[PDB]
Design a protein around this nucleic acid. Structure first.
Length: 50
DNA sequence: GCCATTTTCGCGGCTATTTTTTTACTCCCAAAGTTCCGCTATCAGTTAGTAAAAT
């Protein structure tokens, strides 16, 4: 039991939330690479559906 | 060219009963085929009326 670990609700929720964050980070980087950001606000960059 | 070693391939019990999942995204225009409402017109069925027949 020193080589086996307990992983509970908080850890799993954090892992899946980080997965979603990576999913949106890819698209955020892709958009920020374009350059035309004069009228771009942060809420126009983030898609919460993933 | 045969003897051994590494790599795929296929397998791992039977009946029941509780319950769906989830990202990602241009626009416009001209040309063409299809549909939906309205009207017509014909035929067949139904129904009302009247004469023919029978009591």
């Amino acid at each position: 039991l020193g080589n086996r670990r307990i992983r509970s609700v908080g850890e799993m929720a954090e892992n899946q939330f980080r997965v979603g964050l990576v999913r949106v980070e890819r698209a955020v980087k892709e958009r920020l690479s374009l350059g035309d950001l004069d009228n771009v606000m942060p809420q126009d960059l983030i898609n919460a559906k993933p």
